Amino acid sequence: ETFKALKEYREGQHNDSYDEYEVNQSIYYPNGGDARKFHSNAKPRAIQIIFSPSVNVRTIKM
Amino acid sequence: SNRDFAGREQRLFNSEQYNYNNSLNGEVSVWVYAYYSDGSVLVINKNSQYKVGISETFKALKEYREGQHNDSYDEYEVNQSIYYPNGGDARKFHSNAKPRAIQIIFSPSVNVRTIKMAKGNAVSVPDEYLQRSHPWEATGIKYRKIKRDGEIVGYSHYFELPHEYNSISLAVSGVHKNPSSYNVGCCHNVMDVFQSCDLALRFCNRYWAELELVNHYISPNAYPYLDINNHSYGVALSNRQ
Amino acid sequence: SNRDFAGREQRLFNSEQYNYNNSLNGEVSVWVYAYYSDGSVLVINKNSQYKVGISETFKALKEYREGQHNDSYDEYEVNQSIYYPNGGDARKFHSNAKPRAIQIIFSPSVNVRTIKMAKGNAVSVPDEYLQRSHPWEATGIKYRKIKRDGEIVGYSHYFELPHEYNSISLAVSGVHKNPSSYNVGCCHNVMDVFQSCDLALRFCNRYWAELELVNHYISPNAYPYLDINNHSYGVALSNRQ
Amino acid sequence: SNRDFAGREQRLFNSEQYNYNNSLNGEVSVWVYAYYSDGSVLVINKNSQYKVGISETFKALKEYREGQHNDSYDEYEVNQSIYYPNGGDARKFHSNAKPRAIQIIFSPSVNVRTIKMAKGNAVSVPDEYLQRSHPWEATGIKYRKIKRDGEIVGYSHYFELPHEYNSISLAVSGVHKNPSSYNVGCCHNVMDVFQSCDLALRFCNRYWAELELVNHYISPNAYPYLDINNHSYGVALSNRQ
Numbered sequence A: 001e002t003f004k005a006l007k008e009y010r011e012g013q014h015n016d017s018y019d020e021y022e023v024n025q026s027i028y029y030p031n032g033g034d035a036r037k038f039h040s041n042a043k044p045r046a047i048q049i050i051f052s053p054s055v056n057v058r059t060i061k062m
Numbered sequence B, C, D: 001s002n003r004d005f006a007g008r009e010q011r012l013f014n015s016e017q018y019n020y021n022n023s024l025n026g027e028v029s030v031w032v033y034a035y036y037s038d039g040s041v042l043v044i045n046k047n048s049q050y051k052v053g054i055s056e057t058f059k060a061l062k063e064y065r066e067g068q069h070n071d072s073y074d075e076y077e078v079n080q081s082i083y084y085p086n087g088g089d090a091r092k093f094h095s096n097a098k099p100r101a102i103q104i105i106f107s108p109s110v111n112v113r114t115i116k117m118a119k120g121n122a123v124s125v126p127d128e129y130l131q132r133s134h135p136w137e138a139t140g141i142k143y144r145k146i147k148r149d150g151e152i153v154g155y156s157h158y159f160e161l162p163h164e165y166n167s168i169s170l171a172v173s174g175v176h177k178n179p180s181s182y183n184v185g186c187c188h189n190v191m192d193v194f195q196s197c198d199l200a201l202r203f204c205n206r207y208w209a210e211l212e213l214v215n216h217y218i219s220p221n222a223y224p225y226l227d228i229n230n231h232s233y234g235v236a237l238s239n240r241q
Helices: A017-028 B005-022 B072-083 B190-199 B210-218 C005-022 C072-083 C190-199 C210-218 D005-022 D072-083 D190-199 D210-218
Strands: B027-035 B041-049 B051-056 B101-106 B110-120 B144-148 B151-160 B169-176 B201-207 C027-035 C041-049 C051-056 C101-106 C110-120 C144-148 C151-160 C169-176 C201-207 D027-035 D041-049 D051-056 D101-106 D110-120 D144-148 D151-160 D169-176 D201-207
Touching (some): A017 D210, B027 B169, B041 B051, B041 B190, B051 B110, B051 C190, B072 C210, B101 B169, B169 C190, B201 B210, C027 C169, C041 C210, C051 C110, D027 D051, D041 D051, D041 D190, D051 D110, D110 D151
Antiparallel strands (some): B027 B041, B051 B169, C027 C101, C110 C169, C144 C151, D027 D101, D110 D169
């Protein structure tokens, strides 16, 4: 997944979508964007990766 | 030499400002800063003679973005589910409009031993139920000295609200220092204190970042501040050029 | 026997809550309930030491539905036609946002003889014209005891506004009981009462039905209430398990 | 002298970066730039081990302005009239959302003789009809060396779409250089190449101008670029300080 694809998207509701285009610009390069927030609440705070027990753990790559 | 009158007058002008603020004729001031997860900060300031404070509801401390969408209907529902568990029909687990932290700051003209805080729950009860509530706690011992160049420029109490259950109403209060034995609230001056209640000036605003707060609110007004990095701001004036 | 310490401690814990509230260290509390024709109810609550009250404009008591349509422009006009007959350009004869009834409730820690109400007209004049207005009426004799299990848990004043001309502003005030001869407002404690003004916590909310009010506001907080069926709510604590 | 170890280590650090990229352990990368009449540019980038490519539909290459109006219903219709003449009900002769030009860029770690392109028509057919389509053309001979300071920093294929009939789907593919006789896709490593398919990282974005692309995408990441003035960008690293 891309950075943008991992950001919170709320289906059928407002998403601050124009401002969040700008958030992205300021994430890709410091001071690159014209966003009206310091920290986007759409950014993931954590990640968990889970594999089925049928994986070989020594093959996992990230 | 002692004939540098520019130097002597500069030092006096600053000392006079320091001392005037600390006189019974001067201001006492309080600020509440509410810190939100998007990095924006709400400030509420009040400035008055004699005594000063601030009292806000749970809802009033929640992030409000002027002239933009605020999820306002869903946030009515968030409130209902905060006032009573499962009381609301909200489409989120955690409202990002809830303050993540609070900082209370007093001007150095406060008497720290007079500071009082009522930190209520979300229905504005200080301590679980009204029948068992003392209506304030004296929190002065918890205030840190905000210092610049050796000089106390302010007092800070900082507390996080990092858990889902930190949902608060808040009032704080302090009294202007008075080392005299003259009671400013006794019969000769009491109606002046009643007038001071009417005369107190309030300010509020939401800044997009702590950077803006520091650059455009704290610094231009020579206010005290302590930032999230534990760095002090303000201007030392006592016997200083 | 007298060796049932669980029983004795339960009774003391409750008696202590009763008595603490009624101490000079305790809360006094007031609620204004405004009842609308759609069955929803606005509550305003204030909780403070020493004395407490609530003061609202005509407009502030009108139904407001958070995050939904409110006929807001037409309701500006309704107001103009309420402030002066034929002063407005409203598209309705009677605004359903006007309160149909009011209930004032005080905690049992109030002294009923101190209760004061200023029930103004729509431009906030107590009695027709300011020049002839006493700024309050002492309404204590009109308060009914809200009782549970023999115990007074609160005091209620209920009044309807069933006529087209009942358009009001409203303020109410009461003082915490004090059977002592120690004046809490005299010179030794006066600045504490001034601080109590800053420290008072406010709450407001509109509930969709009296059922919600009873289930999710009155009951979980052990507050007193009297419903439109004349049924009492609250918790008796004096010498009770 | 030979005892300037800062100098020797600087040159090695750069040479190591050059060489690592070109190792079988390193990345191979491709970029598609689509140039629109309003001067904005869409970039699609993919970065992977072993081999890498990009495949897009006609519609996917059309200008999309995030969070703004896009004439989206009319542009559904534009598409219908592109897929079949007079198939749509569009209110324009020429959509300004259609790319005016394409540039394909590969990292210098590609083997140019492995580059393959399938430039289809608007219904994703490489050559008029599927029955007569070879599914790719080997276009390596057309790639220009992007050079800085003597060093090949990338490879460019640039082609305009200046006619009303240049309506394309597009896929491109290249393989990482491998001067060894070790086949990275043979049985000892084949499942690593299958994993590389999962592990490939994609990026896409629309920049308002080529200036922004150069300043904020190409330059900060030490990527190769050739601008519309035929000027080269990138960083030379082989045996350089």
